[PDB]
């Protein structure tokens, strides 16, 4: 039987474009540029899959005749975004799709559905959490992941689950981001840790309640997949089999100095002084006497300094950073102020949202640990 359906343009366009956004820019084989449309009494399903990430959305539609068809995905996305804002009729007549909408008509070739991989089945549901928290937490941690697929152990977000408590962690060897949260667990005996490709997870986050599917009980992570579901949408990503670094060793228990600053004021000041930094390599932070002297540059191109008021206590120090990595950490706090914990100018700096020492580390739900650069 040949698929024939009708549905509202905007509904059609939103569903196709969400599936098509994930399609490979460099398709390993041509058939992976397609999206699959499947019509049943249970509605219209639009899906895509490239052997690593799958995406699937069900939308209400008037199905005049059930069936399945594969067509060029980004082409279908661009068409549905540009059609007149009228109901869209879509009829497959064998090897050819007739698409009509208002005063417009398209005739599109079909692709070889028999060659398209089958979408993986989701593991059992593991837990749920609000979309807002999912998006915030992943955004805070993904910023620290490695971006080099030749070092897969760094390209993941580690996800540790213990009952109702989740810990997310990512590192690229220069910063480490760790976020703790509470979620709604759906299974009891969950004591597991998986590693999820960060880019994929980050994109799933930037798109109502979210359900994570990794399996149940002792089976969590055993199927090598994470399913993410919500709002008639459902995606899967293959887990990484790489081993995550021992990040808890890095978290300092005590600080020789602690400081707090206004996040926006500090961010703007780093952007200003780094204008004279060679290749934006480093900005220097001189802490003492309730004052932060932020500086950069050299005599060849120019020197800059801005002094901003801070709370400071402990051993004064000058410590230098990659200004992009520092802005990245500040932007991830989502708080008005930042609290710093330091040991020495050669050792990691702890950033978290906000007599003379040493200062015990303060419990928090988010840390961004940033290695300095050498002066």
């Amino acid at each position: 039987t040949d698929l024939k359906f009708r549905l509202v343009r905007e509904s059609f366009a939103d569903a196709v474009s969400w599936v098509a956004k994930n399609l490979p820019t460099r398709p390993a084989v041509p058939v992976l540029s397609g999206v699959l449309l499947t019509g049943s009494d249970e509605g219209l399903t639009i899906s895509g899959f490239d052997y690593e990430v799958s995406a699937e959305v069900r939308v209400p539609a008037e199905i005049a005749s059930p069936g399945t068809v594969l067509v060029s995905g980004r082409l279908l996305s661009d068409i549905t975004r540009a059609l007149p804002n009228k109901p869209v009729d879509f009829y497959v007549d064998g090897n050819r799709v007739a698409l009509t909408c208002g005063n417009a008509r398209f005739s599109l070739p079909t692709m070889a559905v028999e060659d398209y991989p089958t979408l993986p089945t989701l593991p059992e549901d593991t837990g749920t959490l609000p979309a807002e928290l999912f998006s915030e937490a992943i955004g805070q941690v993904a910023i620290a992941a490695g971006r080099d697929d030749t070092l897969p152990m760094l390209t993941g977000i580690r996800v540790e689950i213990s009952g109702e408590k989740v810990v997310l962690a990512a590192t690229d060897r220069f910063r480490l981001a760790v976020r703790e949260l509470t979620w709604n667990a759906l299974s009891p005996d969950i004591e597991a840790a998986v590693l999820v490709p960060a880019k994929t997870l980050g994109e799933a986050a930037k798109a109502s309640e979210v359900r994570l599917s990794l399996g149940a009980g002792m089976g969590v992570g055993k199927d090598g997949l994470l399913g993410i579901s919500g709002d008639g949408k459902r995606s899967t990503t293959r887990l990484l089999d790489a081993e995550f670094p021992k990040f808890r060793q890095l978290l300092p228990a005590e600080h020789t100095a602690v400081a707090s600053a206004d996040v926006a004021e500090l961010t703007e000041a780093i952007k200003l002084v780094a204008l004279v930094a060679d290749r934006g390599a480093q900005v220097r932070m001189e802490f003492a006497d309730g004052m932060l002297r932020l500086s950069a540059g050299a005599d060849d191109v120019g020197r800059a300094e801005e002094d901003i008021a801070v709370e400071f206590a402990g051993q004064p120090l000058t410590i230098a950073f990659n200004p992009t990595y520092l802005i990245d950490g500040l932007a991830s706090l989502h708080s008005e102020r930042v609290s710093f914990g330091f040991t020495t100018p050669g050792k990691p700096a702890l950033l978290r949202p906000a007599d003379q020492g040493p200062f015990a580390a303060v419990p928090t739900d988010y840390v961004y640990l940033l290695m300095p650069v050498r002066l």
């Binding site: 060897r173 220069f174 670094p245 021992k246 050669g346 990691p348 640990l369 300095p372």
Partner: peptide
């Protein structure tokens, strides 16, 4: 540009 004292890792 030293790395975090990850062992192994750096």
């Amino acid at each position: 540009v030293p790395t975090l004292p990850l062992v192994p890792x750096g």
